[PDB]
Amino acid sequence: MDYQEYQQFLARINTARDACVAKDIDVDLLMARKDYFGRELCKSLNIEYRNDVPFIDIILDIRPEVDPLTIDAPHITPDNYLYINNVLYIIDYKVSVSNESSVITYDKYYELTRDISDRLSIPIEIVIIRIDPVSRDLHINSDRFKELYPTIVVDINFNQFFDLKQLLYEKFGDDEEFLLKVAHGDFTLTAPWCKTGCPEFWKHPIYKEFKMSMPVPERRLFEESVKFNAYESERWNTNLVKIREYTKKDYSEHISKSAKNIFLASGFYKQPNKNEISEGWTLMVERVQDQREISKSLHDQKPSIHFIWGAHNPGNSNNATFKLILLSKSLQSIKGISTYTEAFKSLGKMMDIGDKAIEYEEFCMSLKSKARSSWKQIMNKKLEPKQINNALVLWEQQFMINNDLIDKSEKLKLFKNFCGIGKHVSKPKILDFDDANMYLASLTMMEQSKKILSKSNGLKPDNFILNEFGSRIKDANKETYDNMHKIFETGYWQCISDFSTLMKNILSVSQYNRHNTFRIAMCANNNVFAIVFPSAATVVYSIIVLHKEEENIFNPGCLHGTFKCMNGYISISRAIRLDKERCQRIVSSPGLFLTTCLLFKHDNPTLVMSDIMNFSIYTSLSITKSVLSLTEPARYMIMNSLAISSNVKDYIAEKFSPYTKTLFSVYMTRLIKNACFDAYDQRQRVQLRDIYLSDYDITQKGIKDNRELTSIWFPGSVTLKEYLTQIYLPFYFNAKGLHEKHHVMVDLAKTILEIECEQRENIKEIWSTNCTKQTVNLKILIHSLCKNLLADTSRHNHLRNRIENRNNFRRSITTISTFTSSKSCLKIGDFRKEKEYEMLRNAMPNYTDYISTKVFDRLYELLDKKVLTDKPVIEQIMDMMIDHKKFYFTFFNKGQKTSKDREIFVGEYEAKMCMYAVERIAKERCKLNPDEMISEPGDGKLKVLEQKSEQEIRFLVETTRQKNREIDEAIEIEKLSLGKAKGLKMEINADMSKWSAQDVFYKYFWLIALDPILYPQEKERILYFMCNYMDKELILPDELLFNLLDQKVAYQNDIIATMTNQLNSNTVLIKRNWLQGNFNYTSSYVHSCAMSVYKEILKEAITLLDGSILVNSLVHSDDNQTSITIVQDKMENDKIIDFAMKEFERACLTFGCQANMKKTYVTNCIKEFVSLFNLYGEPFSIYGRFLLTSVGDCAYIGPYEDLASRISSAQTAIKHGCPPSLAWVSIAISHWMTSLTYNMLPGQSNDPIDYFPAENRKDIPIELNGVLDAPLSMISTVGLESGNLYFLIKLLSKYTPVMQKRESVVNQIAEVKNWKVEDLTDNEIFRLKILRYLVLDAEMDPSDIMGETSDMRGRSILTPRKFTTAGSLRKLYSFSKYQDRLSSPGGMVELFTYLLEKPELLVTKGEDMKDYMESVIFRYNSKRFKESLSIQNPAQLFIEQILFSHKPVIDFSGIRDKYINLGKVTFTEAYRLLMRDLSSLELTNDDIQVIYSYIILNDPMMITIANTHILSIYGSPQRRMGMSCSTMPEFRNLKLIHHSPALVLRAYSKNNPDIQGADPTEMARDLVHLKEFVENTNLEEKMKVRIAMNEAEKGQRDIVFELKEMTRFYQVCYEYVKSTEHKIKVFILPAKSYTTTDFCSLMQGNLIKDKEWYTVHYLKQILSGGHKAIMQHNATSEQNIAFECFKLITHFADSFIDSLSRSAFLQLIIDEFSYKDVKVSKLYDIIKNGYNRTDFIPLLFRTGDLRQADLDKYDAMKILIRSLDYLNNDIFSLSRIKVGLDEFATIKKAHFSKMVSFEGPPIKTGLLDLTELMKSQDLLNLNYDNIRNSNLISFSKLICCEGSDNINDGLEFLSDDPMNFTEGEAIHSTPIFNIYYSKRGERHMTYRNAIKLLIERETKIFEEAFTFSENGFISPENLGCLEAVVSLIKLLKTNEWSTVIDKCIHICLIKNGMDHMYHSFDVPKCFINWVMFREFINSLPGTDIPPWNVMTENFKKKCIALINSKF
RNA sequence: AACGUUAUCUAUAACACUACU
RNA sequence: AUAGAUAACGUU
Ligand SMILES: [Mg+2]
Ligand SMILES: [Zn+2]
């Protein structure tokens, strides 16, 4: 803070030019940070601030009476001291990331002060305060000091110092002397990881080819560089500098040529237009016709939607039996002849139950009841069909196939020709997407669908989502609620819901369907039925629709035929076969449909809901690859069309491959085709917003929001943000796993082998200068690598140690996560038995046998075979790099949502570890590189983009102004503007084609050869590794060989056979394709070096052009974002852009990369990078993806955790900028999906609303199948604790006393003991009982001082148990060993004893090979791990969870245990039993205290959230103008544990604080703290009692129970001992947030309303100083409230009040007002009797005081009161004072929006009441123009005349000093935009003058609005009319419109000087006769003045209504 | 499958819908 | 620089 110091340091940086003083200024910056932290800490702690006070001075201070010069005081200077309770404390402020400085300072101070403490007879306590800059976590060594001050609420931001340090580094980064000076140490290397190098590497054939490739000098340089040793040489850069100097000539020559190329460049770049697009489309259609088989028949189409629908019949019934009878009767009465009419009639006769409906119902209920009585399914009781009429009924809605009632030939025809059950090169058949007839048919189909579906439902729209979230959504936005109502009312919603429910029924009944039975499924609709035919898995079904009259059904091209029948027509759909995944997608479809509709329609009146519905119903239900082939390429086509420069034409001609098998696909293809042209047309209609820079931050930025762009998928006008949403969202409509393994595997192999062939036949040369494809310029690459390595190793000097520490190089193999997971891995060897396949090995000889096992099992096998050991991992990595000669790889399909899947490669363990080592080296190198982005954690790339955009905008504006100063001065001529400099902002968004396949691997070798921090032996070993790796062999998967060997017709041009010697071997040698994803960091790094070369080229070219350039290149892996800002005046921008693109391509090709010009594009402003956008400084993301993933897959273990998993996605959507109403929509959809999973919808069987005392499902807790209910900040912050938390806040608000109602949460939670339990309502009582007994433990006490937090306790209560099969588990070697141990006598008890001996292994990774083996063996005991190990189908789990809803699935024994002191139980019975049990329980005030203490008081985050909810106050709303990213601050600043939690647990397992890698004293402190926590929570005692009681109950030691209890104990300990986790969570907020309170305020204000956001401030200080698991019983202070109040008062008095009356006004407001319900006199008393008095010098001086000591302290911070009096005799400011002749002392500014928190008696000055001015909203702005252009309505609030004559005298009591006004200037750049900023206005513009102009203008307007009589306003008749109206308004009930009219007419009379008559106004004597009053008001000629007509007429209507209602 | 994350759960061991319609 | 399981996003 202290921004004055900020521009002081900025000026110092600007004037800085020497590296020898850069060190000094950096030290000064660090000292400034130190003293700023010290000042803030002292202010927080309410103590005096000192700075290095001498120790003798404090000795004298504490003991003045003792003589000096007798005890030798040490020369140490403590930062501060505190003497209380006869104890002295030494305080020092430290700002570091580690505690080394703190611990050494502690030791020194302690040792020095022991003797003084001994002699002075007073103990000395050393307190060291440490604050970590990146995360503001607090560290206090002394516990006694923490006891003295329980609450510490320090919260500050170091971002200013970080920015200044960044500026310093960028200003001096190139300076080598500066780099070596500021180095924190020297370059050192640890012991080499290996003792000997690899001598056989030099004879490797790959290295021979390498050597032959380079010319002789390069070979020599390489071979000496690989032998260079940094340790041996006197300088580590010697070889680097030598190589750089050698290559400097060639590098400079190439740079000079590339720069001088700019003149040759022409102005014709690759901008797209209609000609290119048309030619590309023609080429595309020609190519498609060549490849795909085009059809022109409508009958050849495939079903766009696998469904047919019809309206429901209200005339009929709804019972299931009646529906079945109606369906049978309809099927039995088919009229006409057709192919399958006889079969359908036979089916109708086949299920004819006759009139025996009751007997059939009895049978089905009996069977159902028998089934719903067992955990497992019933065996050995074979079912038998029962003959009811002519139907052999086997189960409810199931019918046996009776051959008697069906003809055999008809049966075979129906099953084969139609049903397809039982059946036995061409091209894919697609419809002509460009044929006019096909498009006409598509248009007709869509119009018919819209016509049928748009009809009203005819039924009430009541449903679960609306009922349970209407209030929340409507409060969020009324428009969204109305749109949802329109969605629900239409026929589209009914159709989609019926389809979903019917498809769910189909899925349910298809499980138990046999091969000779058929099922019937019904939905809510009485006309829609589904028939499910026998199956084997796949689901085969047909849809049947009964309708009164034909051609009235929704036919998405899937209707097989319509036939006449009784009471109308029956429509049969074609037989549909589907997979379970698509089945579940259809089931979940309604959520996707509703979300898509709401997202598309959100805030867009020009769009029509019908078109959005029509498009969404096809997008959501599209489960075919046809729409997949369209959604993906559309993004690139439309973006390139909108882009400034892109090669869209090629893309269309040789990439866009449409696959249109449906008419909807043709429609969407036409939509995309039109969108391309229309996007090219409208690219110039994008307009940027006006940047409101602040000279220290950028606010109100981004891109203007106006709808001019035509919408793509439907007619309408959309905003650019909405345009991007329409472009990008459809990609997320796709479904993953739509590829069939056969074809996708074949295509992946084809692509890989084709790339291999291309690289073998053509690519033979490695180094070239002409930029050959797949070639690298050697010289340039070497020079760039040398420069980048030098810079990186100069940045940090201990790189090798950091690499070893962070990547666990020293620790064991078992301590690395990636080596112990359960991912797939490959094993090679003689594995004949396990795989058994025989035909493959027999026919095909050369089979490199392989198997796919798990990583952890492979590691266990390797450890068992003694191949690997517990030695440091890196040594074993080197040993394996030498030993492992051969590498093998396999591949499979990722199953992504793209048109073509991305192949995924799996390698062996040895390759995994060696690649891990190399890639971690590269990653730790890249972490220092600013350009590298993978180093930045996830979601921080958005922040990087925002920072780059804002800094480049700043550079552009500054450079433009600086260059055009002279021209602007000359202007205030057209030729001068012509010759003035111009700006150009360009954004290149690029990706690289075939990043892994097409790459010169040799270029990485040099990156290792020139590496300094590697010893020559390590270099040799790594190079031998890569030489072996380039000889990798990819193994064809066994399935590919299976389906290739079973063709019987050889392929014409089989590349696989050619590479496999006609399938004679299953291994293919791959050389130049380093596998997909193996070397991300390495590749990325090299690309960053290439971007650095490009940056140098551009800078050199601009120097030749004599201009300014700023280039920012961001490189993730292959996706590159390059931003260029060029200011120059030589030639037009087109030549510059063409040159930039050409040289970008050249540089990208230089380093062996290849820019995908098809997907690479150029934009003026929009910067897309890894799916993150930055329109213009404004971050943006397509949050629709997270919204659509709300109904994704989940664990399906139980309702609560699935609700949690989907709320997770809802939260993630919120974090990306989703509006609150859409967030509620997503949450509601998630709740609906979870409810539908377990049949919990309202009215259904498992609906628990009836069984609980709840008005609606909101009252039921989440764990009891309730619904979420909390404000958005609650869910987004605490993560599902929001339910209980919000319930408790509601309780506090409802039941706390009025006096403490508005106090802090701590005061209320302490006063809770005074509640009357008899008042609580049942619902509340039930919820409190559930919290107290089901969640908490009864043994806890309200007097506890430390307790477990909600994070350390579970929440799930009801969890079904499924008797799942064991699985195969055969390939698992570790499983075989575990089974042998299990069969071994007494092995398990020995393993359990070992685990008890080291219990920390239960919750922490083992650090030893034996420990890892024991943990792996023990992990098999848990059935969950064994079940998860085998492959599973999420759809199968979902279906089984649906099916087992009614079976006893809840084990009530566990739920009973939770309360004091039979088998499985159903959900409904569980609810009944739980209510019966909780009825017997009881509550008391102590129980409520326990609940509140254990739920709220534990976590400081909970306290902060409760406070920010209770004390929130919302200010003036305003539209969201500029977004900005911000990370969430840590809510737990205090840290009680220092070591890592795993280390602390390891130490606590024993009692030895001294463990490996453990600091002794710090470890002892941590162990003491953990022991205190354990003994205070009684957790050890509770565990011991539990295990003892269980042992007594069983009679023998249930050892597994002991293991589980130990696991729970250590888990709770681990979660308590958690330090800061440094989670990276980014939120898009309307403003920048630095502190925690600012972040909370922005979050609260952003998530309340869609249209606008609010400014939120709190009545009291929300934060609380406490630890994670310690109850807090003390509130905070009020110092910050006083600070805010007095800052606001002083600044308001100075800015808006006349100087003469300022002191009197301040005295009065101190006298009687109060701020935030706190008397301002109390605040003045607090500030006066406080040590923070130097911040209020002017305020004190305006009341005298200051005791002559404040001046002394102020002088010490950087002089007599008598001087001050004369100096400030002139200056009348209340916040600004001048202590010296020029020295100025001021008070920090504050936002005026908090001013609403003031109240008191009115302050009447003249005709103005300043109290309303504080209470006002509009007139608090600082801009003169804003004040002068207000409305009379806002000013009207200030009118209090009581006998004034003129306006001027009353207005005299207003500030006459000139204020600031905002003015703007044009930027004159390629993207044209304005710049608005505030500056000091001249004298003639003041608050007085602004008020005068506003009042005169508004009074004239309102006067001419009320000139009723033609004579004039002052005419006697108009005066009489005004007297009449004032009499009327005074007599009748006061109205706000009446008051504003009265004030306006009164001020008009004041302006005309008629007030004396105004105060003489009365009821006219010529007029209580109300009838003639009505006559007169009805006679009033309401004028049509555009501003005033509305209020006048509304006033007239209100008055006439009131007078009518009066009588 | 590698990565970069983010958030959720931590048990000893033959049948759904059947609806405001 | 928790483990296990699951899910989602982005890159390869
Ligand atoms: Mg990209
Ligand atoms: Zn008056």
Numbering used by the authors: 1 to 424, 437 to 548, 555 to 854, 893 to 1028, 1042 to 1530, 1544 to 1840, 1982 to 2190, 2199 to 2238
Verbatim from the authors:
Segmented negative-strand RNA bunyaviruses encode a multi-functional polymerase that performs genome replication and transcription. Replication initiation is performed de novo, in the absence of primer. Concerning transcription, LACV-L catalyses its initiation through a cap-snatching mechanism, whereby LACV-L steals cellular capped mRNA, binds them through its cap-binding domain (CBD), cleaves them 9 to 17 nucleotides downstream the cap with its endonuclease domain (ENDO), before using them as a primer for transcription initiation.
In this state, the 3′-vRNA is entirely replicated, a 10-base pair template-product duplex is visible in the active site and the 3′-vRNA end, following its exit from the active site as a single-stranded RNA, binds in the polymerase 3′-end secondary binding site. The replicated 3′-vRNA end exits as a single-stranded RNA from the active site cavity, binds to a positively charged groove, before reaching the 3′ secondary binding site, ready for the next replication cycle.
